[PDB]
Amino acid sequence: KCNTATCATQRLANFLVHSSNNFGAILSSTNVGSNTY
Amino acid sequence: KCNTATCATQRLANFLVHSSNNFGAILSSTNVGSNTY
Amino acid sequence: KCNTATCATQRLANFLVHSSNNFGAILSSTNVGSNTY
Amino acid sequence: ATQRLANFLVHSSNNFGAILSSTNVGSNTY
Amino acid sequence: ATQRLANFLVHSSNNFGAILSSTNVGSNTY
Amino acid sequence: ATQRLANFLVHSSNNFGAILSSTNVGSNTY
Amino acid sequence: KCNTATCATQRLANFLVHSSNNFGAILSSTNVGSNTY
Amino acid sequence: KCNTATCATQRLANFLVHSSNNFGAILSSTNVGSNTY
Amino acid sequence: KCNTATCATQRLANFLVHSSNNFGAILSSTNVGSNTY
Amino acid sequence: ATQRLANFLVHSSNNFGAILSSTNVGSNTY
Amino acid sequence: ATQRLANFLVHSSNNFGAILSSTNVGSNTY
Amino acid sequence: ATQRLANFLVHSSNNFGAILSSTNVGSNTY
């Protein structure tokens, strides 16, 4: 592959699995800047 | 492949699986800037 | 492929699977700037 | 058993220059 | 058993210059 | 058994220069 | 005037003189909300 | 005037003279909310 | 005036003279909220 | 004495949901 | 005396949810 | 006397939820 000189190689492979197998209630909220008077 | 000189190679492959196999209620909210008077 | 000099190569391949196999209610809201008087 | 009620109100206002007034009751600004 | 009610109100206002007034009751601004 | 009620109110205001007033009751600002 | 009882009296008289006997330039300005781009 | 009882009296008189006998330049400004870009 | 009882009296008189006999320049400014970019 | 210039630009954008964007360049709000 | 220039740019963006963005460059709010 | 230039840019961004962003460059708030 690189017989003589100057063979710089960066190897990388990414695997990403985000599994959300819900079976129940997920009651989420996000109040940003809201002002309940 | 690179017999003599100057063979710079960056390898990369991305896999991404976002599986959301819901079976129940997901009650979400987002109140940005809202003001309940 | 690159016998002599100056062979810069960037490899990349992307896989993306966003599977949302819902089986239930997804009650979502987004109140931006809304003001309930 | 006699009741007397009196209310004198003299609201006098004069302006000779400038007035800037702002009032945001239950108002917003984005 | 006699009741007397009186209300004197003299609301006098004079202007000789400029007035700027703003009022946003329950109003918004985007 | 006699009751007498009196209220004298003389609200006098004069301006000869500038006034800047701000009031944000229950208001927001983003 | 008030011989027996109950004589409440409020006295008041207002004098106001706003004399502006100008003899020279009065260069005034008022930029409210104006935006000079 | 008040020979027997209950004689409450409030006395008041106001004099106000605002004399501005200018003889020269009065260069005034008022930039409220103005934004010189 | 008040021979027998209950004679409450408040005396007051106001004099106010605001004389501004200018003979020269009065260079005034007021930058409220102004933003010179 | 040879010069070679190359520019490869692949600007790919995908949306599958909501986007709210605001931009006030040199603007004001009263 | 040979010069070679290359520029590879792959700007990829994906969205699957919500984005709220605000930008006030030289703006004001009263 | 040979010069070689190479620039490699892969700007990849993914979103699966919410993003709130604010930026006030030279902006005010009263």
Closest to I21 measured CA to CA, from H22, G21, G19: H22
Resolution of the coordinates, Å: 3.3
Taking the CA atoms of residue D17, residue F29, residue I36 and residue H25 in that order, the dihedral angle to the nearest 10 degrees is 10
CA angle (H32 as vertex; H26, H33 as ends), nearest 5: 150
Query: Taking a C-beta distance cutoff of 8 angstroms, is the pair I31, H36 a contact?
Result: no
Whether residues L15 and K17 touch (CB distance < 8 A) is answered with yes
Whether residues D12 and G14 touch (CB distance < 8 A) is answered with yes
Query: Would you call D8 an interface residue with chain H, using a CB distance cutoff of 8 Å?
Result: no
Residues of chain L found within 8 Å of residue B32, distances taken between Cβ atoms: 20
Taking the CA atoms of residue C14, residue L19, residue C31 and residue L28 in that order, the dihedral angle to the nearest 10 degrees is -140
Give whole-number Cα distances, G10 to C2, E12, F21, H26, I5, in Å: 108, 18, 32, 42, 19
- K4 CA to centre of own chain: 27
- DSSP states of K1-30: -EEEEEEEEEEEEEESS-EEE---SS----
Give φ, ψ of H7 to 5 degrees.
-125, 90
Residue of G nearest to J28 (CA): G35
Chains contacting K (3 or more CB pairs within 8 Å): B, C, H, I, J, L
Integer Cα distance of J3 and J6 in angstroms? 10
Query: Taking a C-beta distance cutoff of 8 angstroms, is the pair H24, I22 a contact?
Result: yes
Query: Taking a C-beta distance cutoff of 8 angstroms, is the pair H34, G32 a contact?
Result: yes
Chain J meets chain A (3+ C-beta pairs below 8 A): no
Whether residues D28 and B37 touch (CB distance < 8 A) is answered with no
Q: How many CB pairs under 8 A join D and E?
A: 92
Integer Cα distance of C20 and A21 in angstroms? 10
Question: What pairs with residue D2 in β-bridges?
Answer: E2, F2
Q: Residue G15, Cβ neighbours under 10 Å: how many?
A: 10
Query: Would you call J27 an interface residue with chain H, using a CB distance cutoff of 8 Å?
Result: no
